[PDB]
Amino acid sequence: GTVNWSVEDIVKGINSNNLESQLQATQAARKLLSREKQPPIDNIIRAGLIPKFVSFLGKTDCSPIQFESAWALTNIASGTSEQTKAVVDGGAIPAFISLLASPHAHISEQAVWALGNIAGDGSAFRDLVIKHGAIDPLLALLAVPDLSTLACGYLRNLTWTLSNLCRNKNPAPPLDAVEQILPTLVRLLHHNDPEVLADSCWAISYLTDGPNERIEMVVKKGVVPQLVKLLGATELPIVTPALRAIGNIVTGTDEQTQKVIDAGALAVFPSLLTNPKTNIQKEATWTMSNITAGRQDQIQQVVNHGLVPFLVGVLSKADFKTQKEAAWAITNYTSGGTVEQIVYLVHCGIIEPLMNLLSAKDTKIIQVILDAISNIFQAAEKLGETEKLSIMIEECGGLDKIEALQRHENESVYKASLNLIEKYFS
């Protein structure tokens, strides 16, 4: 009936002065815009159908045409930025916000979905959706005693749309909008559905990706222990944003980093630092690097949790991106650590894998490793054990690598390598 209609036929039906013909043609457009291979979104836009679909959103007297036009517009808004813009330019934002209060759950959900696509386009459309007042009716749909009474798909779509209102930077979402959403986000983070948990974690990872003031807003809501719990989840779509959020929090103050340690996050790192997913190992090692960039008592917690052998491990063998982050973790540790802590790092076998990485064709990793060597030598100078370290670097073929770096293209590498040879290998 409404299957495989041409755009011309859809236009003829929508341009008729018959509500039922308009409904049948709108359903036909929805089905066209719903096909798996190449939906004709641009053809529907060029035919001038977006203003007609937006006017159909306001037809309270005909709920099926509201649903069909909301679905058609959701499919257009899910496309390119230009396609989303066409939906916004048609006046769809206030029309979709008005549909959030609809007595029909399938229409309200379609309006939630459409607004998530519009807000997800970027900062400007996210902030425009907020200015049109979407946050209050969206939050009202979740103002229930128990989230378990809501339909699964309905809750998943609401969580996803709220996460897009938390997403993007330059600028980050408005402070008052973040404050308004956060109590509902904390509640969704304690829900039992894995898709709700994944998207709630993604929302938290976006909000913590910024200055310390942004991290503070989140950490003050007491979510860090729940994030550490999710960091231990078996589902990879939950662990990925939970680790991103924890990794973002430890870029903050020493006090914000301490809340992550206090919640017991370091006990999860033996498995994260050996995770079969390279991106988990990489971001776990980045997280570790920001913790070793902290206080000496925080470096001590890394030691006590037996995580230094795990850092020796990732430095020895891992994908290059993880090895670069491991090099950073070692340089941060050696910069802020005590002599005893630096001595412990050498005893765990850090020298040989640190030297083997000097062969890498990446100027940044060479600079970072050369800095770590200098810091380890500075500790050895305080104990008068520089000779023991010089022999150790010579034996694993590290001397041949530093000597070769004296003729390197980079200025900082050339200067640092010449300094180490003149001070400890002459």
């Binding site: 990706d209 991103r244 990794g247 973002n248 430890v250 870029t251 903050g252 990489k282 980045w286 690097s289 920001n290 960039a293 991106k321 982050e325 950073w328 941060n332 910069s335 802020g336």
Partner: peptide, 9 residues
């Protein structure tokens, strides 16, 4: 010595 996600990757 803290590095944000964009600084690291």
């Amino acid at each position: 010595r803290k590095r944000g996600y964009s600084v690291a990757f």
